[PDB]
User: Which sequence fits this backbone?
């Protein structure tokens, strides 16, 4: 099970595409547990049996199609810019509405992404060997 | 069976689907209220389709009767079968393209829909327009200035058949709506003259 | 032939005409070459329409067979007699209006519904061609040539050359194609396609 | 366009036929232009009949009907097609001997008593068939060597209005469809309104 | 002996029937009892002349004062007074001229099947059996001389066909009591009729 | 489905009699019929056909449809020639079909039928006999072929099949593809025919063991041109017997 459109820069006045697929299987019903980057297994809608249609405050449409496809459409609400939208389980899909880090040699670092800004950190004599995060048009980087 | 809201988004859910389009299949066995067609060349070993049609709808087909499936489903797996209502007409022997002439009231719609059968189920016709209308005019969408609307298929025998564009019965699942196709109501092209779509 | 010169003209002369639209008349006498119709009750006492049909046409249009007439002429004054080619169908009973579905294809790109209604369930080509040609708005006769293709429900398109005129192009020369009295039941009428080539 | 001989032929070829006579049949469905009757007890499993009567005329679903019709084609391996000849079913065995006259151009021949219907509701297709049959067998009217050049079957009623049927006619081609076309109306008559039949044969 | 046998029948009748019947048409009814309908035939037979149809209880209530009736009945006795006596033979006046060529058969126990299509015409949509019984017998008389003394006939009956499969019998050789016209014709007292659209055909039988 | 038939497989008619030939099918569901002609060799000169079941019909080439045909049932069809004169006397055969008002390929055939048209009769039945095997073949072969000869009979319509010990046999037998004229190519030419059976020396050299040949009798004596001359007999059936023996 995949969410082919993993993370991505959804913008203002925008509807989001996210297609759960499983071509090497056979399906039945699919859920779409929501969240924030921290709170947990929240929810959205789903399908039932093969396909029996779909609180009270919940623009997070869905429309199961083939035993294969079924996407969730989100039409730009104010900025909550992600939470692994997920659909057996599938990978994660980010959203949004910011880079240039530092690295060092011999520990790493990724910095540069009211406002409310952040930082995220990690860390770790053979020749030129290598060691190489996220932001979510598009984004990705490293620190060889 | 109530409410503007729930309906628009009661249909959009299922009319956003991919129909089975297995051409020239063979009927395993037929019984009461249903038809058993073979799709083991489109879907593999042991794979079949089951058409829940009207008693009248059956006794119209039997053992090996090359037929053509084309219908939207109401649920999913069992393992070797595929579920629907009707949409099973005789298999097309030669190839043909039938550009449909039509009108719209609320542009022009000639040659913007193309059937491929001389004898064509209503399910299909039904379907192919809805999508066109969805795709192009976004109707079953939360956003939309369309309360009601229906399709009027017209024959060479002065007779506009009706089709309700904005209708969603009892509960509201795929079974609650695709049942309107259990009648296996067909139509011959040489007797089809055009379609008048009305958006209100 | 006689290239488009003098053609898009002897055409404006031929088809810029008022057609005789006499409905419900009777067979007064049929000959191996013609059909004589009662135009009295439209024209006056002693008046008659004279359809000069092909042999295959005269056939079964005999006395007291009330007919609906629609055709063009090729000359005037013989005072109490009118001349046309073909244009004769059984008399329509119930009143009807048949909106015709169609498309125009002019080469440059090019992708008429409800814009030419018919009122007979059995229509001649003479009436259908003439009505459509009338429609062509696009003031034809940049188009060097074209033709109409009437499609029946049992796939058997019919062709009509929009740009022609058998030499000396009199109305009598161009309208002769309406001598076979060809007709179409609307039930086996689907649509028409007009192809214009610039 | 009197073509007398290329007619006596399409007819002779057409009417020399054994009619479909399935009585007390069940009907399962009926679209518009056509009717679909069940003939399995007669012809076999899955066999059916598709009577093509012009529409707005076309005993929905399981009703009981009686069938008498001259076909116009073959092979669908399960259905025999005809044009009408379908009537409510005859519940009680009955035998009506018909009266009529045969007038040729000697004149005034008898004919009472040798054409018997067995249905109170009888279709004209069946009447126009059984009468042509008698005339063919006994007077040979479609035989090349013959004087009969024109004629018709007149059916008289109890409400005084005769019903005509042209005996020497055939449309466009001369195929069986071209003729049994006229039966499309599945036009019928109640026997207590049938008086006699006057046949006219013009040499 | 003497009660009722063959001859004296083929004669009692031959006298009773070789009679010219009354055929007045479009006559107004004068008054009605419970045993006789009295009609006005004075446009036909001169002032103060009438017909006094003697009917049954059942039939005396069908017609009444100022009714336009057509008469057709054989007389059973004669005048010396301006009134004619018969039994029934009365029906509602015919409003429009009409002809009714009949159809029938004549069977004979000596090579049956003979013909009669178009050989007896009735001119009413409502005819009484008396009129039919008559017109038909008179036919067999004029052509089969069935009541003549030198005859091969001793049996025979008329059968009337209804379009509802309900034949009607009419014994061609019966004459009860003394054997007079008042005896014979008395069978018509009931004034029984038939609508021609319910009339189908007649089959006449003759056994030797 | 199965087979179809032709029931008037043969038999003589006078000069001037329309011949009766029917094509009889049995539960198969035929739906179009053809009537072919086959006067000696060349095989299959079409004459007429019955369109898809019978929507209509026409007669081929272009001359004298006086070979009437009529389809009346998915099971019956007939060809009725016309008069009847030597001019004719061919092999008429029919055929059915499967599919339906279409256009793609033919299906089936029937027994064909023998039509003859004599006059001035003077027919004649066939005398028959059987010959016993030799001492030469029995020696340097050890097989016993027996022969049958039919002769004198005119209307070339007769049938073979040997008889080994009372009942039905047909193996090792050979009969001419057809009867030849005693006096070749002229007329009055009576006919002859012949067949071989050939079995084992042993079994031939074993008596009480019956052997009979059979000519079949199929057709007999036309009138019109003044019937019977003397002896003139009906559908003659003829045979010839023989027993084996070692001696």
Assistant:
């Amino acid at each position: 099970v995949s969410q082919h459109p993993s993370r991505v820069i959804a913008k203002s006045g925008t509807s989001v595409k996210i297609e759960c697929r499983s071509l090497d299987f056979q399906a039945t019903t699919m859920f779409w547990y929501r969240q924030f980057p921290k709170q947990s297994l929240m929810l959205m809608a789903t399908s039932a049996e093969g396909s029996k249609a779909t609180g009270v405050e919940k623009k997070f449409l869905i429309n199961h199609a083939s035993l294969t496809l079924s996407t969730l459409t989100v039409t730009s609400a104010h900025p909550e810019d992600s939470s692994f939208y997920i659909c057996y389980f599938g990978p994660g899909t980010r959203l949004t509405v910011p880079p240039e880090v530092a690295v060092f040699e011999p520990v790493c670092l990724a910095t540069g992404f009211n406002d409310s800004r952040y930082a995220l950190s990690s860390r770790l004599q053979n020749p030129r060997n290598h060691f190489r995060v996220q932001f979510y048009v598009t984004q990705i980087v490293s620190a060889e | 069976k109530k409410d503007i809201s729930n309906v628009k988004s009661d249909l959009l859910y299922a009319y956003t689907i991919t129909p089975y389009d297995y051409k020239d299949c063979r009927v395993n066995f037929s019984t009461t209220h249903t038809l058993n067609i073979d799709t083991q060349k489109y879907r593999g070993k042991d794979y079949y389709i089951s058409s829940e049609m009207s008693y009248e709808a059956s006794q119209k087909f039997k053992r090996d009767d090359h037929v053509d499936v084309f219908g939207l489903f109401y649920i999913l797996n069992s393992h070797t079968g595929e579920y629907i209502y009707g949409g099973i007409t005789p298999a097309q022997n030669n190839k043909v393209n039938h550009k449909l002439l039509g009108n719209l009231f609320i542009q022009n719609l000639n040659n913007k829909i193309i059937l491929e059968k001389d004898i064509v189920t209503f399910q299909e016709i039904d379907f192919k327009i809805r999508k066109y209308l969805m795709d192009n005019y976004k109707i079953y969408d939360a956003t939309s200035p369309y309360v009601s609307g229906r399709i009027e298929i017209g024959t060479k025998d002065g007779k506009h058949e009706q089709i309700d564009l904005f209708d969603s019965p009892n509960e509201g699942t795929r079974s609650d709506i695709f049942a309107k196709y259990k009648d296996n109501r067909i139509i011959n092209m040489k007797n089809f003259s055009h379609f008048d779509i009305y958006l209100e």
Q: What stands out?
A: The domain at 1-16+90-201 of chain D is CATH 3.10.20.120 (Ubiquitin-like (UB roll)). The interface with chain F takes residues 9-10, 12-13, 16-18, 71-77, 80, 173-178 of chain D (CB under 8 Å). The longest helix of chain D spans residues 124-139.
